[PDB]
Ligand binder design. Sequence first.
Ligand SMILES: CC1=C(CCC(=O)O)c2cc3nc(cc4[nH]c(cc5[nH]c(cc1n2)c(C)c5CCC(=O)O)c(CCC(=O)O)c4C)C(CCC(=O)O)=C3C
Ligand SMILES: [Fe+2]
Ligand SMILES: [Mg+2]
Length: 307
Amino acid sequence: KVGLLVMAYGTPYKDEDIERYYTDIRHGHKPSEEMIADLRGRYHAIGGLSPLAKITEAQAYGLEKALNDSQDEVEFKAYIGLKHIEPFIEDAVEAMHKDGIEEAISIVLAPHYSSFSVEAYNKRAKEAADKLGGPRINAINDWYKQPKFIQMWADRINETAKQIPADELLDTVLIVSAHSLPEKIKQHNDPYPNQLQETADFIFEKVVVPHYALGWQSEGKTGEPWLGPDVQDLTRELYGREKYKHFIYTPVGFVAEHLEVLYDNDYECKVVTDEVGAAYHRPPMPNSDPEFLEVLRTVVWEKYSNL
Ligand SMILES: CC1=C(CCC(=O)O)c2cc3nc(cc4[nH]c(cc5[nH]c(cc1n2)c(C)c5CCC(=O)O)c(CCC(=O)O)c4C)C(CCC(=O)O)=C3C
Ligand SMILES: [Fe+2]
Ligand SMILES: [Mg+2]
């Protein structure tokens, strides 16, 4: 049996979890009352709580099922390890150890690598395994280059574009985004920004949308520059420069419908298109669609074959 360590950010299970969840996100530094209320307000705006918890489970166990049905070389056992709420990464690794799992494959539910994201996932998983003495953790760093992943997104964009009048397709633009990070990672050649540009390039060559731009979103409450431009600011510039009639947002850095999509895209971005008078489009996120499980199954299996 090979452990499948599936890792993701995590989301509060109950409204009462928001406080400790934000504290964990802030590296154990309690947010102010005013920050807590702002974040609580955003959750209420998207309906109360994020569906990320159930989607993540569906992805993790959909992947496990997908792998075990497609071959009989090994039995995969999925453990869920969350970054900022239980079950934590270290909990999942502990669960594998007590279960006797000797070798595991880990994957992050975000297709691009960065020092701030996947690297932190792998560091904590590998350090937990070290302390316990097992299991051996073979980390997958990124998988945006998976052809089925690029094609999944192209199909979703093409499905939306084919409902845009032909005489307005030329005024349609594809906005490809991911979670922003401190700009300083670009000073040491972090692959994150360039992996995102590669993703947008690969998708653009497979869609009927004639225009596209790369943006970032959800930058944090800090004092340093973050990767820009922000998807809101980019929408304004693009409309002012080209008067686009349709904006299609694909935050390909994310794999599920959660706060950073339901609010930062479906509210904040729609507010900008509403303002300039253009139409807002946001294709469904991967979630646990069969096509996406197939993407993850292909990635994990290729990683196992290379082991
Ligand atoms: C790179 C990256 C991803 C993508 C890769 C991955 O998936 O790992 C990601 C995902 C997510 N980030 C999420 C939520 C939040 N992230 C925050 C804050 C931050 N994220 C950061 C980084 C990332 N985050 C950073 C550097 C900060 C600043 C911390 C600080 O200020 O020191 C804050 C604080 C409040 C605010 O700043 O708005 C919240 C609430 C949720 C869950 C949404 C839900 O609950 O549905 C998801 C999926
Ligand atoms: Fe975050
Ligand atoms: Mg904001």
